Amino acid sequence: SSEIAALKQEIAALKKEIAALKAGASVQTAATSWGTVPSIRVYTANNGKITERCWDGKGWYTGAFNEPGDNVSVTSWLVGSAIHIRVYASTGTTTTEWCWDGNGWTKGAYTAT
Amino acid sequence: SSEIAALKQEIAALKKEIAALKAGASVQTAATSWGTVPSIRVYTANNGKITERCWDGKGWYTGAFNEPGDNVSVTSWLVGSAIHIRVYASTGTTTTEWCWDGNGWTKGAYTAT
Amino acid sequence: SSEIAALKQEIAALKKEIAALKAGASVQTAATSWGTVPSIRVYTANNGKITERCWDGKGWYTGAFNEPGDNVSVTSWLVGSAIHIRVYASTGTTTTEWCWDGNGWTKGAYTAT
Ligand SMILES: OC[C@H]1O[C@@H](O)[C@@H](O)[C@@H](O)[C@@H]1O
Ligand SMILES: OC[C@H]1O[C@@H](O)[C@@H](O)[C@@H](O)[C@@H]1O
Ligand SMILES: OC[C@H]1O[C@@H](O)[C@@H](O)[C@@H](O)[C@@H]1O
Ligand SMILES: OC[C@H]1O[C@@H](O)[C@@H](O)[C@@H](O)[C@@H]1O
Ligand SMILES: OC[C@H]1O[C@@H](O)[C@@H](O)[C@@H](O)[C@@H]1O
Ligand SMILES: OC[C@H]1O[C@@H](O)[C@@H](O)[C@@H](O)[C@@H]1O
């Protein structure tokens, strides 16, 4: 029938969008580095869950940071040799900040407004 | 009817993908910092509109930067105590650069090719 | 047709999602800068292909870096005047790191686990 064909053509054009939206949806990474060695941290936001890989000159290992998010951005600064890191984990419209300051990750004061 | 069932099954498999892709599409952040205090700037690209939160040691407030974009990246350097910031705002395939150099945001020379 | 209207209404609500997912799908950028001049590098991940634009104080030109990825993050550090740049290109779940250390991009040790 022609009535059944109209929905068949509509379902063929709509399945064409479902492949282009799954082709672009990869992970989402943030990296910062400090010192002369250096030291590197790479935050990987995979499936609404962020994790932290670390380089200290020798090899790579898994850092402590373990927080939820779809998008991540990071900045770090030294006060002498001590590294201060701020990771910004985004879910929906809720950017939530995390703070490393030598011994422990803590939720930060950061508010979007 | 079996002719009405073929579209019911096809519509059940297609509608399942449209909800999960919209559920995971979150906002997108860039951050930079400078000095010892420090000073931080977080740019948040939400609904094709980027905005700038600031921290200068006391609390968080809203910065001047107000430009359109779906994706943002940022880098900053000091010439002494003066901060220079370049924010790269992306819409479609048009990366457009915004320069802060002490007094006023301006469009930068940046061309993708 | 009343029998064919059930899929016509389902297609009217599902085409109500493919416009908003194609409106927000822009390119994805990552910038870093060093020195006092400065020198900037902006990496642009477009259509699973990343490219590198360079500013060294004169105008913008096209950098060597030419690797595949849908998402990109960058950090860099100086050992004296020499720049070292690690770019983290992401496809699917495969974060693959690229290293610049003066003469040549090389695949780096980085492993996600
Ligand atoms: O040495 C490993 C630790 O390094 C710190 O600077 C932080 O990045 C922690 O998240 C990490 O667990
Ligand atoms: O000590 C925690 C505080 O650190 C500051 O540098 C900022 O990042 C604040 O958002 C945070 O609450
Ligand atoms: O002090 C607030 C101002 O700080 C500057 O360095 C810039 O980041 C401006 O966008 C901001 O309005
Ligand atoms: O002064 C504005 C200029 O600043 C330079 O450092 C670059 O960022 C250029 O793209 C920009 O046009
Ligand atoms: O001078 C151009 C070169 O600069 C280097 O520092 C790297 O960024 C290369 O990718 C680039 O080709
Ligand atoms: O020299 C190459 C090496 O550089 C280090 O700083 C790390 O980025 C390693 O992942 C990489 O293998």
Side-chain angles (χ1 to χ4, degrees), chain A residues 5-6 12-13 19-20 23-113, chain B residues 5-6 12-13 19-20 23-113, chain C residues 5-6 12-13 19-20 23-113:
Chain A
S26 75
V27 237
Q28 186 270 342
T29 42
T32 173
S33 56
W34 61 94
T36 107
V37 163
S39 309
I40 306 169
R41 305 284 189 271
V42 173
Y43 304 84
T44 321
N46 172 32
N47 252 234
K49 175 175 192 118
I50 307 166
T51 28
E52 174 196 39
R53 296 287 284 169
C54 311
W55 172 274
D56 284 338
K58 194 168 115 80
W60 291 90
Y61 62 91
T62 292
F65 185 85
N66 238 307
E67 294 299 342
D70 301 294
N71 182 270
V72 61
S73 61
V74 64
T75 181
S76 74
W77 67 92
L78 295 163
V79 179
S81 41
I83 191 61
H84 308 260
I85 318 170
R86 298 296 179 273
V87 175
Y88 298 89
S90 272
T91 288
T93 41
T94 314
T95 301
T96 136
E97 173 195 40
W98 298 96
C99 317
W100 178 271
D101 293 80
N103 54 306
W105 288 97
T106 54
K107 216 187 300 220
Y110 173 83
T111 47
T113 45
Chain B
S26 78
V27 292
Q28 190 264 352
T29 42
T32 173
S33 57
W34 60 94
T36 97
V37 162
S39 301
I40 306 164
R41 300 284 186 280
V42 177
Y43 306 80
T44 318
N46 172 32
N47 253 236
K49 177 173 190 119
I50 310 151
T51 23
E52 170 197 44
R53 295 290 280 167
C54 312
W55 166 281
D56 291 332
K58 193 167 113 87
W60 290 91
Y61 64 89
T62 293
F65 186 84
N66 238 310
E67 300 294 351
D70 301 297
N71 184 96
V72 61
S73 66
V74 64
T75 181
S76 71
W77 68 93
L78 295 161
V79 178
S81 47
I83 195 58
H84 309 255
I85 315 176
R86 301 288 180 278
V87 180
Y88 297 90
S90 268
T91 287
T93 44
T94 312
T95 299
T96 139
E97 168 194 44
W98 295 95
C99 315
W100 178 275
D101 293 78
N103 52 307
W105 292 98
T106 53
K107 222 187 300 219
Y110 177 86
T111 51
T113 47
Chain C
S26 74
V27 289
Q28 193 266 348
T29 37
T32 180
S33 62
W34 58 91
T36 98
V37 160
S39 299
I40 309 157
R41 300 286 187 278
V42 178
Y43 304 85
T44 315
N46 172 32
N47 260 359
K49 175 174 194 117
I50 309 157
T51 24
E52 174 194 39
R53 292 287 284 178
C54 310
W55 171 278
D56 289 333
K58 193 178 131 100
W60 288 90
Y61 64 90
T62 290
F65 185 82
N66 243 310
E67 301 297 347
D70 298 293
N71 185 90
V72 62
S73 61
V74 64
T75 190
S76 68
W77 68 93
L78 292 164
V79 177
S81 47
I83 190 57
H84 310 269
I85 320 169
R86 301 290 179 278
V87 177
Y88 297 90
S90 269
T91 290
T93 40
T94 317
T95 305
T96 132
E97 169 201 43
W98 297 93
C99 315
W100 177 272
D101 292 76
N103 60 313
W105 293 92
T106 59
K107 215 192 300 222
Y110 176 84
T111 47
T113 41

Short mmCIF file of all heavy atoms in Angstrom, two decimals, chain B residues 61-112:
data_model
loop_
_atom_site.label_atom_id
_atom_site.label_comp_id
_atom_site.label_asym_id
_atom_site.label_seq_id
_atom_site.Cartn_x
_atom_site.Cartn_y
_atom_site.Cartn_z
N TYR B 61 31.96 35.41 41.19
CA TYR B 61 31.09 36.44 40.58
C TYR B 61 31.07 36.27 39.06
O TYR B 61 31.81 35.40 38.55
CB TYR B 61 31.56 37.85 40.97
CG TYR B 61 32.93 38.22 40.45
CD1 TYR B 61 33.08 38.82 39.21
CD2 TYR B 61 34.07 37.97 41.20
CE1 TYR B 61 34.33 39.17 38.73
CE2 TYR B 61 35.32 38.31 40.73
CZ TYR B 61 35.46 38.92 39.49
OH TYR B 61 36.69 39.25 39.02
N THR B 62 30.19 37.00 38.37
CA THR B 62 29.99 36.87 36.90
C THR B 62 30.90 37.86 36.18
O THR B 62 30.75 39.08 36.41
CB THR B 62 28.52 37.08 36.53
OG1 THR B 62 27.76 36.00 37.07
CG2 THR B 62 28.29 37.16 35.03
N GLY B 63 31.75 37.36 35.27
CA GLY B 63 32.67 38.19 34.48
C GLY B 63 31.99 38.79 33.27
O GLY B 63 30.88 38.33 32.94
N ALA B 64 32.72 39.60 32.50
CA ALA B 64 32.15 40.42 31.41
C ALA B 64 31.79 39.52 30.22
O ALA B 64 30.87 39.88 29.47
CB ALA B 64 33.13 41.50 31.01
N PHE B 65 32.63 38.51 29.95
CA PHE B 65 32.57 37.74 28.68
C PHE B 65 31.14 37.24 28.45
O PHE B 65 30.65 36.43 29.27
CB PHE B 65 33.56 36.57 28.72
CG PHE B 65 33.68 35.81 27.41
CD1 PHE B 65 34.53 36.26 26.42
CD2 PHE B 65 32.87 34.72 27.15
CE1 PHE B 65 34.60 35.60 25.20
CE2 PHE B 65 32.94 34.06 25.93
CZ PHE B 65 33.81 34.50 24.96
N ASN B 66 30.57 37.59 27.30
CA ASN B 66 29.19 37.18 26.92
C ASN B 66 29.11 37.04 25.40
O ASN B 66 29.00 38.08 24.72
CB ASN B 66 28.14 38.17 27.44
CG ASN B 66 27.11 37.52 28.34
OD1 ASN B 66 26.52 36.50 27.99
ND2 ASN B 66 26.88 38.12 29.50
N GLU B 67 29.40 35.84 24.89
CA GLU B 67 29.49 35.58 23.42
C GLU B 67 28.77 34.27 23.10
O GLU B 67 28.62 33.41 23.97
CB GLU B 67 30.95 35.53 22.97
CG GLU B 67 31.70 36.82 23.23
CD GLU B 67 31.22 38.02 22.43
OE1 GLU B 67 30.39 37.82 21.52
OE2 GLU B 67 31.69 39.14 22.70
N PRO B 68 28.34 34.07 21.84
CA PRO B 68 27.66 32.84 21.45
C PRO B 68 28.64 31.71 21.10
O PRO B 68 29.62 31.98 20.44
CB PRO B 68 26.84 33.26 20.21
CG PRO B 68 27.66 34.38 19.61
CD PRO B 68 28.27 35.10 20.79
N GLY B 69 28.28 30.47 21.45
CA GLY B 69 29.04 29.27 21.06
C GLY B 69 28.49 28.01 21.69
O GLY B 69 28.02 28.09 22.84
N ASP B 70 28.77 26.85 21.08
CA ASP B 70 28.28 25.53 21.57
C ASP B 70 29.44 24.81 22.28
O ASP B 70 29.16 23.86 23.03
CB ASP B 70 27.72 24.69 20.42
CG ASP B 70 26.56 25.34 19.69
OD1 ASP B 70 25.52 25.57 20.34
OD2 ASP B 70 26.71 25.63 18.49
N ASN B 71 30.67 25.10 21.85
CA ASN B 71 31.90 24.53 22.48
C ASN B 71 32.90 25.66 22.73
O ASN B 71 32.85 26.67 21.99
CB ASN B 71 32.51 23.42 21.62
CG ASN B 71 33.70 22.75 22.28
OD1 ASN B 71 33.56 21.71 22.92
ND2 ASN B 71 34.87 23.35 22.14
N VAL B 72 33.67 25.57 23.82
CA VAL B 72 34.63 26.63 24.24
C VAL B 72 35.93 25.97 24.70
O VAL B 72 35.86 24.83 25.20
CB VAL B 72 34.04 27.53 25.34
CG1 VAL B 72 33.71 26.73 26.60
CG2 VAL B 72 34.95 28.70 25.67
N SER B 73 37.07 26.56 24.32
CA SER B 73 38.38 26.29 24.97
C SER B 73 39.12 27.61 25.21
O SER B 73 38.71 28.63 24.63
CB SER B 73 39.21 25.34 24.13
OG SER B 73 39.58 25.94 22.90
N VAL B 74 40.03 27.62 26.20
CA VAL B 74 40.61 28.87 26.76
C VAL B 74 42.09 28.63 27.08
O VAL B 74 42.41 27.53 27.58
CB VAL B 74 39.83 29.34 28.01
CG1 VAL B 74 39.94 28.33 29.15
CG2 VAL B 74 40.28 30.72 28.47
N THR B 75 42.93 29.64 26.87
CA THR B 75 44.31 29.68 27.43
C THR B 75 44.63 31.11 27.87
O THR B 75 43.95 32.04 27.38
CB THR B 75 45.33 29.17 26.41
OG1 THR B 75 46.63 29.22 27.01
CG2 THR B 75 45.34 29.98 25.12
N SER B 76 45.44 31.25 28.93
CA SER B 76 45.82 32.57 29.49
C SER B 76 47.31 32.58 29.85
O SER B 76 47.87 31.49 30.03
CB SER B 76 44.96 32.91 30.69
OG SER B 76 45.30 32.08 31.80
N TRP B 77 47.95 33.75 29.70
CA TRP B 77 49.35 33.97 30.15
C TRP B 77 49.45 35.32 30.86
O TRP B 77 48.69 36.24 30.48
CB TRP B 77 50.32 33.88 28.96
CG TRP B 77 50.17 35.00 27.98
CD1 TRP B 77 50.86 36.18 27.96
CD2 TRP B 77 49.21 35.09 26.91
NE1 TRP B 77 50.42 36.98 26.94
CE2 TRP B 77 49.41 36.33 26.28
CE3 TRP B 77 48.21 34.24 26.42
CZ2 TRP B 77 48.65 36.74 25.18
CZ3 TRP B 77 47.47 34.64 25.34
CH2 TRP B 77 47.68 35.88 24.73
N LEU B 78 50.49 35.50 31.68
CA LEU B 78 50.78 36.80 32.34
C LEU B 78 51.96 37.48 31.63
O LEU B 78 53.02 36.84 31.51
CB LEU B 78 51.10 36.55 33.82
CG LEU B 78 49.95 36.00 34.66
CD1 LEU B 78 50.47 35.36 35.93
CD2 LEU B 78 48.94 37.08 34.98
N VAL B 79 51.83 38.79 31.39
CA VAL B 79 53.00 39.68 31.09
C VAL B 79 53.27 40.56 32.31
O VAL B 79 52.59 41.60 32.44
CB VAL B 79 52.75 40.53 29.82
CG1 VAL B 79 53.91 41.47 29.54
CG2 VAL B 79 52.46 39.66 28.61
N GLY B 80 54.01 40.03 33.28
CA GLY B 80 54.07 40.58 34.65
C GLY B 80 52.89 40.13 35.49
O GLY B 80 52.69 38.90 35.59
N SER B 81 52.04 41.07 35.90
CA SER B 81 50.84 40.78 36.73
C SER B 81 49.57 40.92 35.87
O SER B 81 48.47 40.72 36.42
CB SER B 81 50.79 41.68 37.93
OG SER B 81 51.03 43.04 37.57
N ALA B 82 49.72 41.43 34.65
CA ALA B 82 48.60 41.59 33.69
C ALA B 82 48.29 40.23 33.05
O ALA B 82 49.16 39.71 32.33
CB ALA B 82 48.95 42.62 32.65
N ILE B 83 47.03 39.79 33.14
CA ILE B 83 46.57 38.51 32.53
C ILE B 83 46.11 38.78 31.09
O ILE B 83 45.55 39.87 30.86
CB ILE B 83 45.46 37.85 33.37
CG1 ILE B 83 45.25 36.39 32.98
CG2 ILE B 83 44.17 38.65 33.29
CD1 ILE B 83 46.48 35.53 33.13
N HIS B 84 46.59 37.96 30.15
CA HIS B 84 46.03 37.90 28.77
C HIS B 84 45.29 36.57 28.58
O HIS B 84 45.78 35.56 29.10
CB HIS B 84 47.14 38.10 27.74
CG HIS B 84 47.98 39.31 27.98
ND1 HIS B 84 47.86 40.46 27.22
CD2 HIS B 84 48.90 39.58 28.94
CE1 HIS B 84 48.70 41.37 27.68
NE2 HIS B 84 49.35 40.86 28.73
N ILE B 85 44.05 36.65 28.08
CA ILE B 85 43.16 35.45 27.94
C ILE B 85 42.69 35.37 26.48
O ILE B 85 42.49 36.43 25.87
CB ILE B 85 41.98 35.52 28.92
CG1 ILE B 85 42.43 35.94 30.33
CG2 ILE B 85 41.21 34.21 28.94
CD1 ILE B 85 41.30 36.12 31.31
N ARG B 86 42.69 34.16 25.91
CA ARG B 86 42.10 33.89 24.58
C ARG B 86 41.08 32.76 24.69
O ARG B 86 41.45 31.69 25.23
CB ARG B 86 43.19 33.55 23.56
CG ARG B 86 44.24 34.64 23.38
CD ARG B 86 43.71 35.83 22.62
NE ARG B 86 44.71 36.87 22.46
CZ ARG B 86 45.02 37.78 23.38
NH1 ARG B 86 44.40 37.77 24.55
NH2 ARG B 86 45.96 38.68 23.13
N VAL B 87 39.80 33.08 24.46
CA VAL B 87 38.68 32.09 24.52
C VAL B 87 38.27 31.73 23.09
O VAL B 87 38.22 32.65 22.25
CB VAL B 87 37.49 32.63 25.33
CG1 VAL B 87 36.35 31.63 25.40
CG2 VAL B 87 37.91 33.07 26.72
N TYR B 88 38.18 30.43 22.78
CA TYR B 88 37.89 29.94 21.41
C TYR B 88 36.47 29.36 21.37
O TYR B 88 36.25 28.27 21.93
CB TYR B 88 38.93 28.91 20.98
CG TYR B 88 40.33 29.45 20.88
CD1 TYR B 88 41.19 29.42 21.97
CD2 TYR B 88 40.77 30.11 19.74
CE1 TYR B 88 42.46 29.96 21.91
CE2 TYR B 88 42.03 30.66 19.66
CZ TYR B 88 42.89 30.59 20.75
OH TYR B 88 44.14 31.12 20.67
N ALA B 89 35.51 30.16 20.88
CA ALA B 89 34.07 29.81 20.89
C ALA B 89 33.70 29.18 19.54
O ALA B 89 34.18 29.69 18.50
CB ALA B 89 33.24 31.03 21.18
N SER B 90 33.04 28.02 19.57
CA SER B 90 32.80 27.19 18.37
C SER B 90 31.29 27.06 18.12
O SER B 90 30.60 26.47 18.98
CB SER B 90 33.45 25.84 18.51
OG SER B 90 34.76 25.85 17.97
N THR B 91 30.85 27.37 16.89
CA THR B 91 29.47 27.11 16.43
C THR B 91 29.51 26.57 14.99
O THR B 91 30.30 27.11 14.19
CB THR B 91 28.60 28.37 16.53
OG1 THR B 91 28.31 28.60 17.91
CG2 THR B 91 27.31 28.26 15.75
N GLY B 92 28.85 25.43 14.75
CA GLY B 92 28.98 24.69 13.48
C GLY B 92 30.41 24.26 13.22
O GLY B 92 30.92 23.42 13.99
N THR B 93 31.10 24.98 12.33
CA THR B 93 32.54 24.75 12.04
C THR B 93 33.31 26.07 12.20
O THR B 93 34.54 26.06 11.98
CB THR B 93 32.74 24.16 10.64
OG1 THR B 93 31.89 24.87 9.74
CG2 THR B 93 32.43 22.68 10.58
N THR B 94 32.65 27.10 12.75
CA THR B 94 33.22 28.47 12.86
C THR B 94 33.80 28.66 14.26
O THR B 94 33.00 28.87 15.20
CB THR B 94 32.17 29.53 12.53
OG1 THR B 94 31.51 29.15 11.32
CG2 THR B 94 32.77 30.92 12.37
N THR B 95 35.09 28.35 14.43
CA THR B 95 35.86 28.72 15.65
C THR B 95 36.19 30.22 15.60
O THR B 95 36.81 30.65 14.61
CB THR B 95 37.14 27.88 15.77
OG1 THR B 95 36.75 26.51 15.88
CG2 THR B 95 37.99 28.26 16.96
N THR B 96 35.68 30.98 16.57
CA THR B 96 35.89 32.45 16.64
C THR B 96 36.56 32.81 17.97
O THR B 96 36.19 32.20 18.99
CB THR B 96 34.57 33.21 16.45
OG1 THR B 96 34.54 34.30 17.37
CG2 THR B 96 33.35 32.33 16.65
N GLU B 97 37.65 33.57 17.90
CA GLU B 97 38.56 33.80 19.06
C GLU B 97 38.21 35.14 19.72
O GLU B 97 38.11 36.14 18.98
CB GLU B 97 40.02 33.77 18.60
CG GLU B 97 41.00 34.29 19.65
CD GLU B 97 42.39 34.58 19.12
OE1 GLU B 97 42.49 35.18 18.03
OE2 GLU B 97 43.37 34.18 19.78
N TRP B 98 38.26 35.19 21.05
CA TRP B 98 37.97 36.43 21.82
C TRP B 98 39.15 36.75 22.75
O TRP B 98 39.56 35.85 23.51
CB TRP B 98 36.66 36.28 22.61
CG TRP B 98 35.45 36.15 21.74
CD1 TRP B 98 34.85 34.99 21.33
CD2 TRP B 98 34.75 37.21 21.06
NE1 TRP B 98 33.81 35.26 20.49
CE2 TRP B 98 33.72 36.61 20.31
CE3 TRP B 98 34.88 38.60 21.04
CZ2 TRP B 98 32.83 37.36 19.54
CZ3 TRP B 98 34.00 39.34 20.29
CH2 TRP B 98 32.98 38.73 19.55
N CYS B 99 39.68 37.97 22.66
CA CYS B 99 40.92 38.38 23.36
C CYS B 99 40.58 39.31 24.53
O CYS B 99 39.74 40.21 24.34
CB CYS B 99 41.89 39.07 22.41
SG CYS B 99 42.06 38.23 20.81
N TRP B 100 41.04 38.95 25.74
CA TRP B 100 41.11 39.90 26.88
C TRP B 100 42.58 40.25 27.16
O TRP B 100 43.43 39.35 27.06
CB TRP B 100 40.43 39.30 28.12
CG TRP B 100 40.52 40.17 29.34
CD1 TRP B 100 41.54 40.23 30.24
CD2 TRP B 100 39.55 41.14 29.77
NE1 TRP B 100 41.28 41.16 31.21
CE2 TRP B 100 40.06 41.74 30.95
CE3 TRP B 100 38.31 41.56 29.29
CZ2 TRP B 100 39.37 42.72 31.64
CZ3 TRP B 100 37.62 42.54 29.98
CH2 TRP B 100 38.15 43.11 31.14
N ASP B 101 42.87 41.55 27.31
CA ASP B 101 44.26 42.06 27.41
C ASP B 101 44.31 43.22 28.41
O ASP B 101 45.36 43.88 28.49
CB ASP B 101 44.78 42.50 26.04
CG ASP B 101 44.97 41.35 25.06
OD1 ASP B 101 43.96 40.88 24.50
OD2 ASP B 101 46.13 40.93 24.86
N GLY B 102 43.29 43.31 29.27
CA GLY B 102 43.29 44.25 30.41
C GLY B 102 41.98 45.02 30.50
O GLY B 102 41.52 45.25 31.64
N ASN B 103 41.55 45.61 29.38
CA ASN B 103 40.32 46.44 29.33
C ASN B 103 39.59 46.18 28.01
O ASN B 103 39.74 46.99 27.08
CB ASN B 103 40.64 47.93 29.49
CG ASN B 103 41.71 48.41 28.53
OD1 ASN B 103 42.79 47.84 28.47
ND2 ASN B 103 41.41 49.46 27.79
N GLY B 104 38.67 45.20 28.01
CA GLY B 104 37.75 44.96 26.88
C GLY B 104 38.03 43.64 26.19
O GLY B 104 39.22 43.27 26.09
N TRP B 105 36.98 42.85 25.95
CA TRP B 105 37.03 41.70 25.00
C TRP B 105 36.99 42.23 23.57
O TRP B 105 36.07 43.02 23.26
CB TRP B 105 35.88 40.73 25.28
CG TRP B 105 36.00 40.00 26.58
CD1 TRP B 105 35.40 40.31 27.77
CD2 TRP B 105 36.83 38.85 26.85
NE1 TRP B 105 35.77 39.43 28.74
CE2 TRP B 105 36.65 38.52 28.21
CE3 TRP B 105 37.69 38.06 26.07
CZ2 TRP B 105 37.30 37.44 28.81
CZ3 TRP B 105 38.33 36.99 26.67
CH2 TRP B 105 38.13 36.69 28.01
N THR B 106 37.79 41.63 22.68
CA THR B 106 37.75 41.91 21.22
C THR B 106 37.78 40.59 20.45
O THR B 106 38.45 39.65 20.92
CB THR B 106 38.92 42.82 20.81
OG1 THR B 106 40.13 42.24 21.29
CG2 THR B 106 38.79 44.23 21.35
N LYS B 107 37.28 40.61 19.21
CA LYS B 107 37.43 39.47 18.26
C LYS B 107 38.90 39.38 17.82
O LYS B 107 39.54 40.44 17.72
CB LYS B 107 36.51 39.65 17.06
CG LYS B 107 35.80 38.38 16.60
CD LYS B 107 35.03 38.56 15.30
CE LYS B 107 33.94 39.62 15.37
NZ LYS B 107 32.72 39.26 14.65
N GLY B 108 39.45 38.16 17.82
CA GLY B 108 40.87 37.92 17.51
C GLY B 108 41.08 37.60 16.04
O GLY B 108 40.11 37.15 15.40
N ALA B 109 42.34 37.60 15.60
CA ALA B 109 42.70 37.38 14.18
C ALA B 109 42.40 35.93 13.80
O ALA B 109 42.56 35.59 12.61
CB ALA B 109 44.16 37.71 13.96
N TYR B 110 42.17 35.07 14.80
CA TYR B 110 42.19 33.59 14.61
C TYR B 110 41.32 33.22 13.41
O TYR B 110 40.13 33.58 13.39
CB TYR B 110 41.71 32.88 15.88
CG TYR B 110 41.63 31.38 15.76
CD1 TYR B 110 42.74 30.58 15.99
CD2 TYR B 110 40.47 30.76 15.34
CE1 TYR B 110 42.69 29.21 15.85
CE2 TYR B 110 40.40 29.38 15.19
CZ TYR B 110 41.51 28.60 15.45
OH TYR B 110 41.45 27.25 15.31
N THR B 111 41.92 32.54 12.42
CA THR B 111 41.17 31.92 11.30
C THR B 111 41.54 30.43 11.21
O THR B 111 42.75 30.13 11.20
CB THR B 111 41.46 32.64 9.97
OG1 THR B 111 42.88 32.74 9.83
CG2 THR B 111 40.84 34.02 9.91
N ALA B 112 40.54 29.57 11.01
CA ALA B 112 40.71 28.10 11.09
C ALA B 112 41.58 27.61 9.92
O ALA B 112 42.25 26.57 10.08
CB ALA B 112 39.37 27.42 11.10
#
